[PDB]
Amino acid sequence: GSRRYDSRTTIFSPEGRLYQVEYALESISHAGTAIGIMASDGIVLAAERKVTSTLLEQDTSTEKLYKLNDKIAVAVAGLTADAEILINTARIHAQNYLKTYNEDIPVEILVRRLSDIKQGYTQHGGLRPFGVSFIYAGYDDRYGYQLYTSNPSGNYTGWKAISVGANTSAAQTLLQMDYKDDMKVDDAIELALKTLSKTTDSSALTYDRLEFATIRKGANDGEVYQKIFKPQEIKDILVKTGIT
Amino acid sequence: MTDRYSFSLTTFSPSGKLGQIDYALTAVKQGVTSLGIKATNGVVIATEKKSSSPLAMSETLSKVSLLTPDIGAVYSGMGPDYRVLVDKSRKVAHTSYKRIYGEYPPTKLLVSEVAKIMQEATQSGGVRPFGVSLLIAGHDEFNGFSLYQVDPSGSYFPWKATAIGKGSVAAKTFLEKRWNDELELEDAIHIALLTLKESVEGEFNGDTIELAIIGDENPDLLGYTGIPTDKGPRFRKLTSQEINDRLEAL
Amino acid sequence: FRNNYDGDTVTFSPTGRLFQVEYALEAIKQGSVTVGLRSNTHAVLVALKRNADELSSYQKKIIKCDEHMGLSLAGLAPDARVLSNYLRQQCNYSSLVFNRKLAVERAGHLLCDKAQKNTQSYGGRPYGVGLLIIGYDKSGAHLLEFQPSGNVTELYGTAIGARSQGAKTYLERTLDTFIKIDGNPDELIKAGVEAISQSLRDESLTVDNLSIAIVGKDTPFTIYDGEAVAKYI
Amino acid sequence: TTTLAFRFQGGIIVAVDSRATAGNWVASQTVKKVIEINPFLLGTMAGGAADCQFWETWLGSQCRLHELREKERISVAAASKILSNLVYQYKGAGLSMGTMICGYTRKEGPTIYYVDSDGTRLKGDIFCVGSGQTFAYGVLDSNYKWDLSVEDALYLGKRSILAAAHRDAYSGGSVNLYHVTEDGWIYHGNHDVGELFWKVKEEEGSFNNVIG
Amino acid sequence: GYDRALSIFSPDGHIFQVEYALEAVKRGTCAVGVKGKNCVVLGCERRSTLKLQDTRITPSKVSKIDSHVVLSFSGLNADSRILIEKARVEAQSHRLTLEDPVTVEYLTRYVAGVQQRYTQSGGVRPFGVSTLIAGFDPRDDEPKLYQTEPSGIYSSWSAQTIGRNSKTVREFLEKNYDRKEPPATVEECVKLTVRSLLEVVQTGAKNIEITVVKPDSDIVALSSEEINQYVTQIEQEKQEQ
Amino acid sequence: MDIILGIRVQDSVILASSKAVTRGISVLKDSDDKTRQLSPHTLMSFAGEAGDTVQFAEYIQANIQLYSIREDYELSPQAVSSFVRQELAKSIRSRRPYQVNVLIGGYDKKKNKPELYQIDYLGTKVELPYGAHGYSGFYTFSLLDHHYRPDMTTEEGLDLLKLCVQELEKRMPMDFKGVIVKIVDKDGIRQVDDFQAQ
Amino acid sequence: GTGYDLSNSVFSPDGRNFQVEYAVKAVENGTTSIGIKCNDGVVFAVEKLITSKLLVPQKNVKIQVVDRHIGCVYSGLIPDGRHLVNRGREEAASFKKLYKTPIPIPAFADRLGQYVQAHTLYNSVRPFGVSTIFGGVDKNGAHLYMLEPSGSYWGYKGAATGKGRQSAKAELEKLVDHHPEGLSAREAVKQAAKIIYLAHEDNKEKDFELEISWCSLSETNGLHKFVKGDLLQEAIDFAQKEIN
Amino acid sequence: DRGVSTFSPEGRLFQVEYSLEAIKLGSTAIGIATKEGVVLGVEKRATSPLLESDSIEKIVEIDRHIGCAMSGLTADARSMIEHARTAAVTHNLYYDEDINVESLTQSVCDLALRFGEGASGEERLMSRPFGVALLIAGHDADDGYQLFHAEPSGTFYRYNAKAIGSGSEGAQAELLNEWHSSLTLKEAELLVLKILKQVMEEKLDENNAQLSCITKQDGFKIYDNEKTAELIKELKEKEAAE
Numbered sequence A: 001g002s003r004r005y006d007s008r009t010t011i012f013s014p015e016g017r018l019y020q021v022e023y024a025l026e027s028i029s030h031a032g033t034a035i036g037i038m039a040s041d042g043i044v045l046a047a048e049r050k051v052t053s054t055l056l057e058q059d060t061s062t063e064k065l066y067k068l069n070d071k072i073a074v075a076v077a078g079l080t081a082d083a084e085i086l087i088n089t090a091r092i093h094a095q096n097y098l099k100t101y102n103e104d105i106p107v108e109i110l111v112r113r114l115s116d117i118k119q120g121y122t123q124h125g126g127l128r129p130f131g132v133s134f135i136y137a138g139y140d141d142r143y144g145y146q147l148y149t150s151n152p153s154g155n156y157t158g159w160k161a162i163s164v165g166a167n168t169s170a171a172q173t174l175l176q177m178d179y180k181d182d183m184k185v186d187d188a189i190e191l192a193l194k195t196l197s198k199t200t201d202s203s204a205l206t207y208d209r210l211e212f213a214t215i216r217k218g219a220n221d222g223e224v225y226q227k228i229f230k231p232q233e234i235k236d237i238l239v240k241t242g243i244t
Numbered sequence B: 001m002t003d004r005y006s007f008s009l010t011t012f013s014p015s016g017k018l019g020q021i022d023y024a025l026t027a028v029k030q031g032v033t034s035l036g037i038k039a040t041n042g043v044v045i046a047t048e049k050k051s052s053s054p055l056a057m058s059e060t061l062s063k064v065s066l067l068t069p070d071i072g073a074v075y076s077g078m079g080p081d082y083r084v085l086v087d088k089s090r091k092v093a094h095t096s097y098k099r100i101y102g103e104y105p106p107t108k109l110l111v112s113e114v115a116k117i118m119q120e121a122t123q124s125g126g127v128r129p130f131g132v133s134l135l136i137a138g139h140d141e142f143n144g145f146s147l148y149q150v151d152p153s154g155s156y157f158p159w160k161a162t163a164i165g166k167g168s169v170a171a172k173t174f175l176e177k178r179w180n181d182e183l184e185l186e187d188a189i190h191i192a193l194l195t196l197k198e199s200v201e202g203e204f205n206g207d208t209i210e211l212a213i214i215g216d217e218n219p220d221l222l223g224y225t226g227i228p229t230d231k232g233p234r235f236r237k238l239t240s241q242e243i244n245d246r247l248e249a250l
Numbered sequence C: 001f002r003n004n005y006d007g008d009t010v011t012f013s014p015t016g017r018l019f020q021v022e023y024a025l026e027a028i029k030q031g032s033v034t035v036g037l038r039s040n041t042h043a044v045l046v047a048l049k050r051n052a053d054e055l056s057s058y059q060k061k062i063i064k065c066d067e068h069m070g071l072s073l074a075g076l077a078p079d080a081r082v083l084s085n086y087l088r089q090q091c092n093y094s095s096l097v098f099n100r101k102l103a104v105e106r107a108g109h110l111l112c113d114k115a116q117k118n119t120q121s122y123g124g125r126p127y128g129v130g131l132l133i134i135g136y137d138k139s140g141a142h143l144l145e146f147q148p149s150g151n152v153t154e155l156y157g158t159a160i161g162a163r164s165q166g167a168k169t170y171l172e173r174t175l176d177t178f179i180k181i182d183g184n185p186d187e188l189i190k191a192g193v194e195a196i197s198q199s200l201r202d203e204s205l206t207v208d209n210l211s212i213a214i215v216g217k218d219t220p221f222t223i224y225d226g227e228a229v230a231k232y233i
Numbered sequence D: 001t002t003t004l005a006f007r008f009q010g011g012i013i014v015a016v017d018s019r020a021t022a023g024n025w026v027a028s029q030t031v032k033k034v035i036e037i038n039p040f041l042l043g044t045m046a047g048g049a050a051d052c053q054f055w056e057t058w059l060g061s062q063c064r065l066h067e068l069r070e071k072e073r074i075s076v077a078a079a080s081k082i083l084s085n086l087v088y089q090y091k092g093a094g095l096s097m098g099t100m101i102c103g104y105t106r107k108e109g110p111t112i113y114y115v116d117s118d119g120t121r122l123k124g125d126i127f128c129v130g131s132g133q134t135f136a137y138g139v140l141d142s143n144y145k146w147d148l149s150v151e152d153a154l155y156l157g158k159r160s161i162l163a164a165a166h167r168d169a170y171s172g173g174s175v176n177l178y179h180v181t182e183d184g185w186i187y188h189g190n191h192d193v194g195e196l197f198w199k200v201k202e203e204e205g206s207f208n209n210v211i212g
Numbered sequence E: 001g002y003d004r005a006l007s008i009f010s011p012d013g014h015i016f017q018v019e020y021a022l023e024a025v026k027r028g029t030c031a032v033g034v035k036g037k038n039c040v041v042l043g044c045e046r047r048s049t050l051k052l053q054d055t056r057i058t059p060s061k062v063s064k065i066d067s068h069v070v071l072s073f074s075g076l077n078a079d080s081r082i083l084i085e086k087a088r089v090e091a092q093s094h095r096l097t098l099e100d101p102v103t104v105e106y107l108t109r110y111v112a113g114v115q116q117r118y119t120q121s122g123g124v125r126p127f128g129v130s131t132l133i134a135g136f137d138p139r140d141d142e143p144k145l146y147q148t149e150p151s152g153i154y155s156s157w158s159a160q161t162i163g164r165n166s167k168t169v170r171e172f173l174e175k176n177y178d179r180k181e182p183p184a185t186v187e188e189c190v191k192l193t194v195r196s197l198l199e200v201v202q203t204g205a206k207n208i209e210i211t212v213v214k215p216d217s218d219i220v221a222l223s224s225e226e227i228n229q230y231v232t233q234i235e236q237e238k239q240e241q
Numbered sequence F: 001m002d003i004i005l006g007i008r009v010q011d012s013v014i015l016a017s018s019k020a021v022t023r024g025i026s027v028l029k030d031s032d033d034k035t036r037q038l039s040p041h042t043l044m045s046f047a048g049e050a051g052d053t054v055q056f057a058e059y060i061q062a063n064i065q066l067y068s069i070r071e072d073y074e075l076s077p078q079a080v081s082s083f084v085r086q087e088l089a090k091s092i093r094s095r096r097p098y099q100v101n102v103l104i105g106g107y108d109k110k111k112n113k114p115e116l117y118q119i120d121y122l123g124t125k126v127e128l129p130y131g132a133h134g135y136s137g138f139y140t141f142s143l144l145d146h147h148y149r150p151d152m153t154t155e156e157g158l159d160l161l162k163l164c165v166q167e168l169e170k171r172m173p174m175d176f177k178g179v180i181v182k183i184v185d186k187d188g189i190r191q192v193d194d195f196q197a198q
Numbered sequence G: 001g002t003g004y005d006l007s008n009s010v011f012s013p014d015g016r017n018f019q020v021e022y023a024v025k026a027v028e029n030g031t032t033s034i035g036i037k038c039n040d041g042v043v044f045a046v047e048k049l050i051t052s053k054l055l056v057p058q059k060n061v062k063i064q065v066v067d068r069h070i071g072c073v074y075s076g077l078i079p080d081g082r083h084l085v086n087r088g089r090e091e092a093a094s095f096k097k098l099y100k101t102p103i104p105i106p107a108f109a110d111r112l113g114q115y116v117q118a119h120t121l122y123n124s125v126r127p128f129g130v131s132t133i134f135g136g137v138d139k140n141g142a143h144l145y146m147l148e149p150s151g152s153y154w155g156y157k158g159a160a161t162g163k164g165r166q167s168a169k170a171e172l173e174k175l176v177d178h179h180p181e182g183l184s185a186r187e188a189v190k191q192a193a194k195i196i197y198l199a200h201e202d203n204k205e206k207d208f209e210l211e212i213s214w215c216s217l218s219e220t221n222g223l224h225k226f227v228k229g230d231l232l233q234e235a236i237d238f239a240q241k242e243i244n
Numbered sequence H: 001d002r003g004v005s006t007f008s009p010e011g012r013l014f015q016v017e018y019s020l021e022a023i024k025l026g027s028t029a030i031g032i033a034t035k036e037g038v039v040l041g042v043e044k045r046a047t048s049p050l051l052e053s054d055s056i057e058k059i060v061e062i063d064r065h066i067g068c069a070m071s072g073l074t075a076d077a078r079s080m081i082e083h084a085r086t087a088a089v090t091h092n093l094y095y096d097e098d099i100n101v102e103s104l105t106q107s108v109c110d111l112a113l114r115f116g117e118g119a120s121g122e123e124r125l126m127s128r129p130f131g132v133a134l135l136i137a138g139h140d141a142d143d144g145y146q147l148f149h150a151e152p153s154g155t156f157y158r159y160n161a162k163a164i165g166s167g168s169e170g171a172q173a174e175l176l177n178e179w180h181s182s183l184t185l186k187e188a189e190l191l192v193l194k195i196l197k198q199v200m201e202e203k204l205d206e207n208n209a210q211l212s213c214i215t216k217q218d219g220f221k222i223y224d225n226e227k228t229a230e231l232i233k234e235l236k237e238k239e240a241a242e
C-alpha cells in the first residue's frame, strides 16, 4: 500500500531530535532576518525583505509584518504561505476570546495557542510542520509590553530583544552588546536598523528592502497604538540613524 | 476506495528545501511566457497561445480567464492545473465573499483565497502541489488597479509589471527599462505586445496571442439597463481583430 | 527473490503466488496433528494436544459450534477462536431467523468467504489456522477441511498439522472399511485413534493427551477428555 | 414506599417499609428497599422499583471498581455523586427514584446523602422519602434528639415507619432496620406490621383510633 | 485518517521510538526534586546560551497542576504543555466528581497513563518528556514525590533528578541524602537541592531556580536573591578545607 | 421560587440567598447554601430547576478554577460574568437548556470597585446597584429604589438587606427558612454568621 | 530505477500493470474451464482434480449460479471466484429490485467488468486471480462472456481458460467451422465433455471429475440447470468414445 | 518497510515474537498452585537506592478471588488490568456471581491480537502488541485453585507452577523438580522465596521482593513487608539445617 511512500514526518532520530522540525529550522535560517526590541515605552519590529526587484510594488506589499490584533502584531520568518494559515487562526482566536470575556486577549495566551497548533503537526497526523518562526510584539494590562518568539517545534520563549531567520547568531550577539534595560523607543529603533545593516547579505540596507513597525502608547492619547511604517516613512528614519 | 495517503507528499529535506514546491517551479519555467503590466488607468495581462495541433481550434482554449467582473487571470505552467484552479477561484469568490457581503471580493482577498488553496496542496495528505504560477489583474473601488503573482508554494507578490514562464528573465529586464508611474493604458498594451514578441518564435498576430485588460467599466457588456449603480465589467478580453490593429502600427 | 513479494497479502509474486498466505499455511504444518473421518451415520474428530511443560495443561483443540456441528484446530488458536465465534453466530442466525439448522456445506462457504477478504485487502494479515469441521445436517454426516487461503473441501477423511501425511495415507487405504461403520460410534473412534497414531513420531498418546469429538444421527456434538478417552488408549 | 434515615449520637439509623404497588394493587409485601453496597455503605429505594434496583446495584459495581482502582473505600459524598450524575444524564427521560446513600468513612464520619431523579443531591442529618414521608416526619421530628440511645434511636426509626405504614395506603408490609457505626452497618431485623402494630398499641398505649 | 504504527517492536525487544524519546529527555535541562520531613523542593536549571530572556513572561519549568501539586519536566518543552494541560483538566474534573482534590499518586498515574497511551496508538509518537510530580495529599502532611517517563512507567522517590548530567547529580544525592534522617527544616532541604545543581551548573544565580511546596496548598517560588544567598553560603563551605 | 438577592454598596457586594429546599409538600432542608465561590474575589448565587441549578454552578466553578491555574491569574468579575452569559446563551438554544438564574458578586482588585451582575437562564446580563431573581424582585426592587444610596457602608448595606428580608417574610407566601448572607470585598469572601437574629 | 511490479495501480514505463499480469499467472496455474454458446443457450463445463480417494464425489461444486438464469465458472484462485460471484449475486438482485426484469447478460457482464477493473486502480487492493466464463439467456437470446483479471471482457462463441486453454481453443475453433449454422443444446453438452477430457492431457498425472451445466431456451426454459445422472453419463461415454 | 501483523517464512508473527523478547528482559515473577491456595511472587528490581520500593506495584488485585502478577513492560499492563477488573465486576452485575478464572483470562487474551493498521473483519485500534506477560491466579467453585500464564500471542496456558521474565528458564527447571501435588501453602511461599533468591542479581529481602496469595477464605491478599521478612528469616534457617 502507501507504507512505501510515507516520510514519517513525526518521528524521533536516534539522537532524540525531530527530523522535520530540524530541517524546517534550516529552511528558516535562509529567510530574511527579522528583529524585535522591547523598550520601556514600546516595542520595535524590523524585518528584511528577500530578493527584491525595482518593479516590485512596496505600497501594496506586506510579507513579513502582520496585524493579529488591535494590540498584537507579528514578524514572520520562513514560508509566507504557511504563516498566513497560522496568522488567520490567530486572528480568529483573539476574536473568540473577546466574544467570550469582553476583554482583549492577553498576549501570552494567543502565543501559547499558536505554539500548541504547531506542536500538533509534530506529534500526530503525519503531515509536514509549518516552516515558520514568529516574533510576537504585544501589550496587555497584566505584563505591559511583551516580546515572544515561536518556532516550528511549538516552543515559545520571552525576550527583551530577539532575532529570527538568517544570521540570528550574529544578530543576537550585537543586540546583547548594545541593549540596556532602561531604553527609550527612539534608541531601540536605531539598534534594530544598525543590527540589520551589519548582518545583511546585501550591499546596503535600503527602504525598498525593509518592513518596519512600532507599538507605542499615545504621546497624548493614553492608549496603545500600532504603526506599520510606510516606504516614505522608513526612508526618513533611515536617513536619521546614519545609513541613508 | 480506501485512500491510504493521509500523510504529506511534500516534506523538508536536510538542506531545508521543500522538494515538491521547487520541482513545481521547475515545471513553471518550461511553460509558455505570460506577463502583466499595470498602468495608471488600467492593467493588462498577456500570453502566447501555443497550439498543440494546426487541426485544433485555439478559440476553444482560453489561457486568459475572467474570475469576477473586475478580476482576470493568466498563467504559466500546466494547463489542466490552471483550469481547475480557475473553477475553484470563481466559486470561492461567491462562497467566501459575495454570498456574505453582496459584492465581489477585492483583488488582494481573492488572491489570498487562491493562495490558500495552493498552500493546502503543499501540506495536505496524498496530494502534490499545483504546477502553475498565476498572474491576477483586477480593480476594486478602494484599492484601484492591482497586479499579483501567485507561486506553487502559495506565496503572492504585488507587481508594477512582471513576466513568468520561459523567457521571464529577459522579459523582466525589458519591462524594467520601459515601465514608469505615468503610463496610460494604451501605452501599457503597446509594451505588452513588444515584450511578448521576444518570446514568440513563430506567427505573431491576434490568433496566436491572447490579451485582456482591466480598464473602464463596459456598460455595453453588462447585458441589462436599469440599475445606475451597476455600470458593467472592467475585465475585457480583446478580440483577434483588436490586437491586429495595434500590430499594424507597432 | 522472495525478499520483495512477501511484504503483505495484497501483493502478487511474478509466478502468481501469495506468500503471506503461504506462510500462514506453514503455521498449520507446525501445529499439532488432528484427524477427521466419517461414515453415513456419524462423523468423528480425533486431536493430539500439545503442552509447554510437564507443569502445563494441554491446549484444547476441539470447539463446539452448535448441537449438530463443530470443528478442530491446527495452528494459531486465537484465530481459531475468532473463526469459531463467527461460525457460532452464523449457526445462531440460521436458527433464530429461519428456525433452520445450518448446513455444513454452507458453513464452509461462509468460512471460505471470510478468509478470502483477508487475502485481498491491504493492512490485514491472513488467518493462521486450519480447521476440520464435522456435522450432521439434513443430508447425513459431513467432514470439511478449511485452509486460510479460502479453500474448503468436503471429504470422507483427512488430517492437518505436523506429520499429518502419515495419517492421511492410512485413511486413503482404509476408505472402504470405515465408511461402512454405521450405527456403531465406538468402532469409528477406534478407526480415528488408529489413524492419528500413524502421525506419532515423538510420543505415546495418553489420557490427558488425547481428545475426541463425535456427531451423528442421534448424537449431539460432544467432547471427550481425561478418563472418558481411556478405553481408546 | 416509606424510607427514613437519621443521624444521632451513636451513628445512623435506617428504616424502610417493604410494599410494592401497581396503582391500588399490592404487588408485594416483601421487598428489600435497602441495598448493601459494602460493609460501610447502604442505599435506600423509593419510586420506580426497576429504576432503583437496577441503578443502585449498578452503583454497587461503581463503588467496587473505585476500591480496586484507588485501593481505598469510596467516600459517601463520592458514591452519592456517581448516582447523582448518572441520574442527571437521564433528566427528562422519566426515571423515578428517591434515594438515600448512608455510610461511614474516617474522613467524613457518619454521613447521609439524599439523591432523587430530578438531579437533587443533599447532605443532611434527617431525611424521609416516598409517598409516606410526611407520616414519618410527624413522628420522627416530634421525638428526635441527638442524644438518643442506640436502643431508643432504633425504636424511633421502627415506630416512624409504622406510623407511615398505618396511614399511607401505599406503605406497609414489614419494617427493615439498620444501624450504621464506625465498624459498619448492623442489621436489626425484619418486623411484620401485622404483628408489630398490635404489640406497639398494647405496650405504648398509642393508636386509639383503632378498634381492638 | 493517519494511523501508521510508529512505536513498534524490534528484533531485540525494544521500542525504538520510546528509546529515542528518552534521548530527548537526556538532552533537556536538568531537573531535581528532594523531599524533607515537612516539604518537597523542586530545582531546575535555566540555559545560559542566550542571556537576553525576559523572565517575567518566559514559561518556567515548575508548573502548578492544582493548588497543592506541582510538575517539573525534562525534555521537549512544547510536549510538556500538552501533558500539563491534560493533568490540569483532570485535576478540576476529579474535584468535580469526587469532591476532593487529587492525590499526588493519582495525578501521577493519570499523567503516566497518557504517556503510555502514546506508545501504543497509531499515528502518534511518544512524549519526549520525563516529569517530576510533587505535592501534598488533601489534609495530609506527608511529602510526596513521583517521576514519570515516556514509556509510561512511574514510581515514587525520596530524591530524584532527570535530564542532562543527571547521572552526576543522582550520584551526589545517593551519598548525601539520608533516608533515616531526612532534611528537618525547609532551609535544610533547600540547601541540599542547590548543592546538587552546583555539581552540574557553573556559578549561576540566574541559572538555578527553586520552588518550595509545603502542606495545605502553600507553594512559593524563590527569588534570584534568595537562591543567590544559598549559593553564597555553600561556596564558603569548601574553602574551609 | 428561591430567594436570590444582591446589593452593591460603596466597597462591597452583598449576596443573600434562600435557605429552604422544598420538594412537593415537604421542606427537605433549611440550611442550603445556594452559592459557589468562582474565585477568591468572585461569588455566584443561583436559583431555578432542581438539578440544573447545582450542576451549572459547579460546572462554571471548575472552568474558572481551571483558568486560574493555567494563567496564574484571577479573571475580573466582568470577564467571569461574560463567560457565564455565553454558556447560558449557548444552552438556551440546545436540546435541554439549563434553567438557572444567577447573580455574580465580585470585587475587581484592579479597578478597586465592587460589581453585581444579574443574568437569567436566557443569557440576559445587566450590571446593577441591586438585583433579584424570581418573585423576590417584585417586592425588593421598589423598596431599594427608595432606601438605597450609592455610597452606603457595608454595615448600612446589611441593614438594608434586613429590611428586604423582613418584607419578604411578611408578604411572600412561602416559608423560605431565612437567608445565608455573604460579603464580597477587597479581602475576599466571608459569611455573616449571625443574620437569622442579627 | 525499477520496482514497478511491487505496487498494483502503478504504470510501468512501457504502460503495463505488472500486478495484473502476475494475477494472470495465477489463472494459467489453475484448472481448465470452458463455455460453448449454442443456438438457444449456453453450456459450461469444468475439470475437477481428484487429489485423493478421500474427496467425496459430486460434492465440491465449482460452477455457480447468479439469479436463476446466469451461470458462472472460473479458473484460478477459487476464493476470488467465489467473491466475484457474491458481488454478481448482489448486483443482479439490486437490478431486479429496481427494474423488475431479471438482469440482461450484457448488463451483468459490465457489472463484473467495472468491479474487477476497480481492483486495478488502487495500491491498497489486490487484482482478481481469476478468469471467469459466464452467460445465460435473456430477452434477446443466448450470451457468452469471458472476464480477465484486468477487467477486460468480450462476447464469445466459445471460451476457454486455465491449464488446458490451448487444447480447448484449438478444439473450439474447429466447432465454429464445422457447425456454421449453430449447434444444438444437447450436442453442445456432449461436445463440452470431449473438450474437458482433451484438455486433461495437460494435467494427465492425476485423476479428475467432470462437472457440466447448461442454460437453454428449449431444454431448460431459459434457466440455469446442472447436468445429472443419465444425461451426464451420456456425455461421459461420448467423450470416452472419442479418445481411442 | 513491512506490515505490522505479517507472518515470517517460518509461520510466526514478527511483532508477537519480538514482544516475547521484551518480556525476557522483564523482572522475574513466580506462581505456584496448591490445594490450599495459589502463591504469586515478584522481583521488585529498583534501578536506584533512592527509589521507594513499596511504590513498585507488580502484584495487583483483579477481584477478591482473582490476583495478577506482571513481568516486562509493566506500563503496558495498566489497561489490561483495567479491562480485567471491569470484566470481573461487569460479570457480577449481569450474573450476580463471581467470574471464573478461566473466563477472565480468556477475556484478557482477547485483547492481545487487536493490533494493526485499520484492518479487515472487526476493529483493531492498537499500534503494537502488549510488551508484558501476566500470571493470573485465583479460585472458583468449578475448577478450584488455578494459575494461568497469559501471553501477548493471545494464547494462555494453565500451570501448576510457572516462572516468567529474565530468570524464567533457570527458575522453571527448578520448579519442575520441586513441585508436587500435595504441597502446603507455607511450603509454596518458602519455595517462591527460594527460587527468587537464586535468580536475582541482588540479595533478596523484604524490600526488593514481594509475596501474595489467594485463598478461598480470605481471598487475594498482598503480604506486608513485616510478614515476608519473617518467611525469609524462616527460609534462611531451613537451608542452613540441610
Ligand SMILES: *[C@@](C)(CO)[C@](*)(O)[C@H](CC(C)C)NC(=O)[C@H](CC[S@@](C)=O)NC(=O)[C@@H](NC(=O)CCCCC)C(C)C
Pocket: D001, D002, D019, D020, D021, D022, D023, D027, D031, D033, D045, D046, D047, D048, D049, D050, D052, D096, D130, D131, D170, D171
Ligand atoms: C412505595 C410503594 C410508593 O410507590 C415505593 O415508592 C415503591 C418502591 C419500591 C422500590 C418497590 N414503589 C413501587 O412499588 C412502584 C410504584 C410506582 S410509582 C412511580 O407510581 N411500583 C412499581 O415500580 C411497579 N412497576 C411498575 O409500575 C412498572 C410499570 C411499567 C409499565 C410498562 C412494580 C409492580 C413494583
